[PDB]
Paper text:
PhaCCs-CAT is folded into a globular structure which belongs to the α/β hydrolase super family and comprises α/β core and CAP (hereafter referred to as CAP) subdomains. The CAP subdomain covers a cleft containing the active site residues that comprise the catalytic triad. Our structure comprises a closed form, which has no visible path for substrate access to the active site located inside of the enzyme. We found several clusters of water molecules at the interface between the CAP and α/β core subdomains, suggesting potential mobility of the CAP subdomain, which may undergo a dynamic structural change during the catalytic action of the enzyme. Inspection of the PhaCCs-CAT and PhaCCn-CAT structures suggests that the catalytic domain of [name] synthases exists in an open-closed equilibrium in solution by means of conformational changes in the CAP subdomain.
A typical example of a C4 SCL monomer is (R)-3-hydroxybutyrate (3HB), and [name] polymerizes the acyl moieties of 3-hydroxybutyryl-coenzyme A (3HB-CoA) to the high molecular weight [name] product poly-hydroxybutyrate (PHB). [name] is generally depicted to form a dimer which is an important form for its functional activity.
Numbering used by the authors:
A (entry chain A): 174 to 371, 385 to 562
B (entry chain B): 174 to 372, 384 to 562
Write the structure that this text describes.
Amino acid sequence: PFQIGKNLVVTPGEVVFRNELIELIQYTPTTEKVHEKPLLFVPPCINKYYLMDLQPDNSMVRHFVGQGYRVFLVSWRSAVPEMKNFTWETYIEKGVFAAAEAVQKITKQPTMNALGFCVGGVILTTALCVAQAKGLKYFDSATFMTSLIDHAEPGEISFFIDEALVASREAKMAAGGIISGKEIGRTFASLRANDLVWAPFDLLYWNNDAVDLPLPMHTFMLRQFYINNALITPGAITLCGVPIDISKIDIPVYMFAAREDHIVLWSSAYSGLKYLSGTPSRRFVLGASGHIAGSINPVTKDKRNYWTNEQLPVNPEEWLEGAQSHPGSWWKDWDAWLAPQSGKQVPAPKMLGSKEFPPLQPAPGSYVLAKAMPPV
Amino acid sequence: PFQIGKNLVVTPGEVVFRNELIELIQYTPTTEKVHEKPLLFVPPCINKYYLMDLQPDNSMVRHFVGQGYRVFLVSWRSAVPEMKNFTWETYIEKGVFAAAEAVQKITKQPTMNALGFCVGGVILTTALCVAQAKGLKYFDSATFMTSLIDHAEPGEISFFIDEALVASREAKMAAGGIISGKEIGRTFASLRANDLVWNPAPFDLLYWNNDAVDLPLPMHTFMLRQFYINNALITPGAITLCGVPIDISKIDIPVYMFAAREDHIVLWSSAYSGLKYLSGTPSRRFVLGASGHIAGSINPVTKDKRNYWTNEQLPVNPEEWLEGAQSHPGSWWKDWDAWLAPQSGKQVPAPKMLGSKEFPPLQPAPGSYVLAKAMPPV
């Protein structure tokens, strides 16, 4: 069967940093030269990251390392009791910022480009606001891959959030707790039959390999984003001492959505763009197909197509009407957008980590191997 | 590994009638006596029927035959070019009514009870209106299993209907056409991630899901326009079928409605919303099953897992219905059986032959139409 790290999730590298929330994976170079400016992947913390690193042929991380990027990836710890009080803020501080700090220390580069996928995109979005407000310059650009900002139309999840249960948890928040992967899967699972082509056993395995979340983080996510749609209203939430205002984000943004995505409706993603009014530029790219088939659409096979349009009208239907279709994988377009923002070519590093951050264990590390807690 | 008719869809019987749209399957009795009044299953047409007849343990058809019902089932023909002009009305006439006429002729019984599942329930609803208006008495009761009547909240499908495409097809309706299984699977999706858990499951369901059908363009276009966009059934006379202005307040037989609590395809409160429009009926029953679209609908008595909820009161607010409901362990099929059986006549000896002299058995169940594969890409 599947053994994570052995016949799945095999892109070579090392865990180079670990804390109470993350392992940071640094991938081994496969090119003689690399773009100097690192690339940080922020996967979701619902399910395991390795949707982005399945087999070599369909691995997103492997592709980008092969394009010369200095790829680092956040591997989230599945919640256990010592994490029962962790909050959304913990994911910003101990997740995104801790990762960014380690990247700066290891590479000696002052900044990086960031990618956030699914809920990792929402965490990244909030992290960007905190960083901007505090003058912390971690990121030179941000990419949001099938992630919401405007949660007004979150899809069918809207019908299945139990507001009374969220309120019950809020009442007892200070005690913390653990939300089971089983519970999370009833609302946040993202696999559909049409993603299985026709290993589609890889995807079936991934879908069932669930992870747990801290109660405070999860309850806040439901209340503030899904119910209150807080990000569209400046100052509606406060994180890390900062009133959150998406209009303050001030770096180039790339936003990817998939046309047939039933999990993150493409028009709902598109709706976020108008809120990013402090950015110097925004790029929206629409991939063909469904959530997984469209998102994880590799260049190795280069199937399907994507659409581009540099004009960003308010109406997504107008965007699409003016768009140009291009054959193959949107990864190519993202690469072309990222590369000019990635510095000059330098020799590939000969070692993983650094003296201060020595390699700890081979990729894919220990946190991705955890099994969800037993039923309670 | 899956061979339809051999290790799935194996409830014994015979095709006893065939026309350009349907094969009617009559199932072999497994009881010495049967309820006299037959039971007609009108399955989904957007997918193949055999979600209702998977493995023996989870087969709905097999269970009901084993309870003593004289079960007949409509197996819909996947659309081919000779069907490219078929309409919604065709599904009423060549589907539901043709089946009911054959049942009458084979059994010599004047009426039957009907079950409609998913879009089969919608077709059945419209057929009941036509029959009522024309004084045709085919049905003594109707059961709607995860089917909409009020389409105001149809769920995620709303986001995946392109009105402009519907309109362009309306403009060219006379020419007819075929809507591919691929297109159908991009707008309708019967499965969710919880149905795909893996450690046959989930492969039996994936095979069923991927065993796609095609639909005639006029039927499918009408379905999208009139139900999903216009929500025509809630307005008397908003559509006309078979010469008849459709007014669901005219339906005048007992109704049973099933929905599943965690159903993402047919939201249970959306199903519930239809009940208030069935104002001509002598009785209405709503039953809510635990779990999702597949596991909640096809929840067999053999294992008798999960639960269902009952409440005789029918308030406008579905939350009020649920707050007043009583939970019962196991399968809702038990409840449906208890509702159906008193409406199913006396016990008579099981028929010794399938079909009749006029309707001889044509081939063993599950027949030929179910074995057809979708047309190639174009």
